[PDB]
Design a protein around this ligand. Structure first.
Ligand SMILES: CSc1ccc(COP(C)(=O)O)cc1Nc1nc(N2C[C@H]3CNC[C@H]3C2)cc(C(F)(F)F)c1C#N
Ligand SMILES: CSc1ccc(COP(C)(=O)O)cc1Nc1nc(N2C[C@H]3CNC[C@H]3C2)cc(C(F)(F)F)c1C#N
Lengths: 298, 302
């Protein structure tokens, strides 16, 4: 149906997870509590959360034919995630990583295997019929190509009435100067704690006041700060805050940011206020932190 | 599965594990996200590695080990088949995980950090072994793990051999590679007993000669005890009391020693299974494992 789906453009990675009691010291040999294979990656994880929340969703990302992609595709389908827009690559490998999750505190150590796999381009995005989407979320990576995709969405929206415009969100998660041009695109801009700290900011309040001038007219800038909850700032100038909802036992924080992002997107897509969406994001990601994986989030 | 001729195969009973190996510039701090230089998925495990070598040496061979249905087992089974290893006797498990380890190798200093597989998968039991028709095997090699259950499997092989003529008896070998006291009862079983340098050093022995003379009294009548000592070659000792030695055949450049013990073990087993002498099998074991050390993986062992 027209204007019914939420699209997430980004990465998909096969995470081989080991759950440990204590983080291994260098040059030591420890035994894990349990092992897992999880479909991971920023946009891919957000799609999982969106499907668990009851939102019809679709993933757009690069994958290469093979047994790693075969596992990932079957998991996307198991979670009712639309994979029709996946950019299949003739050359390269589908990403895979080693994740060490500390059971005593939820810390997640990641050894990524970045592969030759080309990024999703603006020409790949050109081929996408935008009518089926109500929201499009893009994870900042190949910034110059992504700006064209965002301009395509802006152009599409100039021909639509207010109730038919596709809402857009962007995430600047890596501290790379190429990505900072993405701040000026989208209705909602998520900027990570890592990026904020690299830019010299020491709190979510400092970052939002310091970076708001970079967002486009009327946009909302969101900054999550792990156990300190999350803050948002919109055109009225009023800083909003939500305390975190930490679990009494933190066991798995892998994908907590993606859970927060998907939950804020979901709440805003349902007509909820920015203050409510901020709270809801902390509530869902807080519950995730006390669980292995994403089952049991709602 | 196809017809396997009677008394043609070499069986290795033991472990199979999926080893995810990552080469890094710097060791990752806890809760950090780093990018590795290279990643590798390798089928590992002592018995599993010996099967690979046996297939490359030209021996028909089979693996017996625990696996649980799933994606990790799917990868391992496809790798066993890639190396022509018979997996018909695998003990499939209803509960547990197929073993998998994470190895982080620091490129700047050679350090290896290992997150070892969990223990949820049950080991191959004596009741699982009872159900196996032994006629297709000429040799059975057991990797010491769940010692009390393995002793029953060894007694089953002994009983089988009491009803066979000399040319139909299945030759047996055991490996004591881990320094655990439960395993030391396995010294008294098998025609050939391999004991690792690690085990020998833990028992207070400082050379392969010290270990063989020190432990020979624990082996069964007429058995051969074998001990490899990395760059110092390898020694064997049988009932004649003569300590046999072979110098190592190191490669021009050492590249990869992972599975060198398993290569030595499979090569000694192979040579003895072909009717060669203990001295000849010892030399052959050093020659094959020496060539392996100068290669990545097992391709090119010849
Ligand atoms: C407010 S919701 C939120 C939004 C974004 C992110 C960033 O996540 P990201 C992109 O690094 O995946 C995290 C969270 N939430 C949380 N993060 C926690 N930590 C993230 C650190 C990195 N790893 C472990 C560290 C601790 C801990 C908690 C707690 F309280 F449970 F202990 C919550 C909660 N609640
Ligand atoms: C005699 S053949 C043999 C049989 C068994 C094993 C044990 O294997 P294992 C349980 O470690 O899998 C190793 C070998 N051979 C060798 N091992 C080498 N090292 C393995 C050690 C582990 N610590 C560092 C050491 C380096 C080195 C060499 C050399 F000389 F080429 F450099 C040979 C040769 N030749």
């Amino acid at each position: 149906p027209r204007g019914s789906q939420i699209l997430c453009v980004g990465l998909v990675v096969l995470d081989v997870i080991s759950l440990v009691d204590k983080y291994p010291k260098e040059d030591s040999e420890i035994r894990c509590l349990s092992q897992r294979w999880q479909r991971g990656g920023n946009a891919s994880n957000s799609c999982t959360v969106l499907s668990l929340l009851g939102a019809p969703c679709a993933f757009m990302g690069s994958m290469a034919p093979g047994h790693v992609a075969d596992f990932l595709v079957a998991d996307f389908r198991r979670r009712g995630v639309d994979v029709s827009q996946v950019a299949w690559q003739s050359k390269g490998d589908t990403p895979s990583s080693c994740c060490i999750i500390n059971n005593s505190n939820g810390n997640r150590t990641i050894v990524l295997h970045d592969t030759s796999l080309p990024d999703v381009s603006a020409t790949d995005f050109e081929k996408v019929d935008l009518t089926q989407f109500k929201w499009i979320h893009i994870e900042g990576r190949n910034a110059s190509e992504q700006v064209k995709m965002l301009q395509r969405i802006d152009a599409h929206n100039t021909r639509q009435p207010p109730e038919q415009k596709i809402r857009v969100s962007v995430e600047v998660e890596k501290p790379r100067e190429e990505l900072f041009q993405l701040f000026g695109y989208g209705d909602v801009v998520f900027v990570s704690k890592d990026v904020a700290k690299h830019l010299g900011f020491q709190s979510a309040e400092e970052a939002l006041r310091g970076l708001y001038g970079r967002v486009r007219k009327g946009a909302v800038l969101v900054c999550a700060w792990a156990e300190e909850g999350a803050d948002a700032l919109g055109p009225d100038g009023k800083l909003l805050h939500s305390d975190a909802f930490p679990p009494p036992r933190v066991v798995d924080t892998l994908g907590a940011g993606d859970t927060f992002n998907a939950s804020v997107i979901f709440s805003l897509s349902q007509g909820r206020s920015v203050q409510e969406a901020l709270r809801f994001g902390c509530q869902v990601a807080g519950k995730k932190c006390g669980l292995q994986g994403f089952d049991g989030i709602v």
